[PDB]
């Protein structure tokens with residue numbers, strides 16, 4: 001159990017973790033009460049945990065979180081990045097406010113901007129080989145999130161640094177190794193800098209509001225107690241990291257899969273309407289978010305496996321998506337299959353509010369990319385980041 005998880009953590013396996021994921025799933029649920037940890041990997045088990053009324057997202061109920069806090073020799077810096085309690089009503093209230101701005105029909109209005117952005121980025125692409133990450137996959141969703149949150153493009157390099165650091169902090173290193181990350185100090189600093197910057201931006205938007213989402217949230221904060229400044233900072237932290245470290249991998253993973261599967265790139269190049277099917281199959285086959293976690297709010301049962309109160313439950317979504325009880329030929333990338341209702345955007349009370357935006361960004365980017373370069377070929381094996389949870393490529397080289 002410990003061995004297989006350590007192989008999964010090993011950066012050398014990031015390029016292809018799926019043989020390990022399948023091996024973990026076939027081995028069944030991993031019960032590790034000694035490390036306050038349970039690991040689920042089948043579709044049934046992951047679904048059940050995401051559904052369970054006792055499953056908590058709040059860190060206060062985590063035993064590992066309580067142990068980590070007790071061992072620390074200094075107070076954590078002020079801000080939601082270190083700590084913010086939210087009861088179920090707080091969470092529902094925040095989702096309600098954010099969901100209106102991220103509704104598919106509101107997000108749809110960003111298509112012209114996204115289309116012009118995709119066209120300009122592709123116009124800038126030079127042969128004989130280019131890095132898809134640098135040229136399209138990364139800068140597109142970054143430009144969209146910066147404009148949506150009203151963040152100045154001049155400060156983007158600093159927002160890029162903080163998002164990369166905080167996206168890596170979501171790796172369950174403490175739950176799996178027993179010790180904290182080697183980037184812990186930098187992640188703390190990035191959290192501090194973001195807090196101070198967003199606090200300064202919030203104040204500026206009080207005096208001089210814009211048409212951005214941050215300015216919209218400030219107006220709600222200013223109109224009544226329905227929203228606090230800390231809640232705005234927490235929300236904007238989440239959105240900013242989502243904008244930098246998620247869609248990039250949906251776009252890039254899909255491009256990679258099409259290049260690795262004979263005829264798939266050509267098919268999309270000849271028929272743009274295949275975009276949606278390619279995207280959903282990428283969400284299943286090579287998910288941008290590889291895993292999620294929940295904490296047992298009380299003693300609970302998943303199937304026949306009991307989880308003690310306070311323990312962390314890691315859900316290996318990448319493994320769940322290749323479960324032979326839910327999908328035929330699970331380890332094959334096939335956009336022409338009868339698609340499953342995958343867990344790539346989560347589900348229930350915590351379902352991804354950015355799903356419409358992510359889908360829209362990819363739906364514009366991918367078919368334009370294939371149509372622009374129908375002759376495209378993967379020139380070499382891709383280069384991956386250390387990230388396990390928000391897993392992605394730093395280099396995806398395409399020959400043109």
Ligand code: HEM
Nearest residue numbers: 239242246247250288289292344345346350352353354358
């Ligand atoms: C393809 C890209 C994306 C993927 C694969 C993805 C995946 C996910 C998943 C799996 C969850 C559930 C977390 C859990 O259950 O613990 C989630 C939550 C969330 N996502 Fe995304 N996401 C993406 C892009 C985005 C974007 C671009 C935004 C907006 C900027 C966004 C906003 C959110 C928010 C606000 C939540 C929290 C909802 C809640 O806690 O109630 N996501 N995402």
Ligand SMILES: Clc1ccc(CO[C@@H](Cn2ccnc2)c2ccc(Cl)cc2Cl)cc1
Nearest residue numbers: 057058080081084094095098234235237238
């Ligand atoms: Cl729409 C929406 C808006 C905001 C949140 C809050 O999300 C929490 C995490 N959390 C806790 C329980 N479920 C997720 C959070 C995000 C960022 C920071 Cl820096 C700190 C915290 Cl505590 C959730 C949904």
Ligand SMILES: Clc1ccc(CO[C@@H](Cn2ccnc2)c2ccc(Cl)cc2Cl)cc1
Nearest residue numbers: 081166170237238241242246289291292389
């Ligand atoms: Cl300091 C800080 C604290 C909390 C967050 C939340 O980060 C979100 C970003 N995200 C990713 C996809 N959609 C949104 C997130 C990360 C990992 C997972 Cl598994 C799920 C989620 Cl919702 C970010 C920074």
Ligand code: NA
Nearest residue numbers: 057091349350
């Ligand atoms: Na949540």
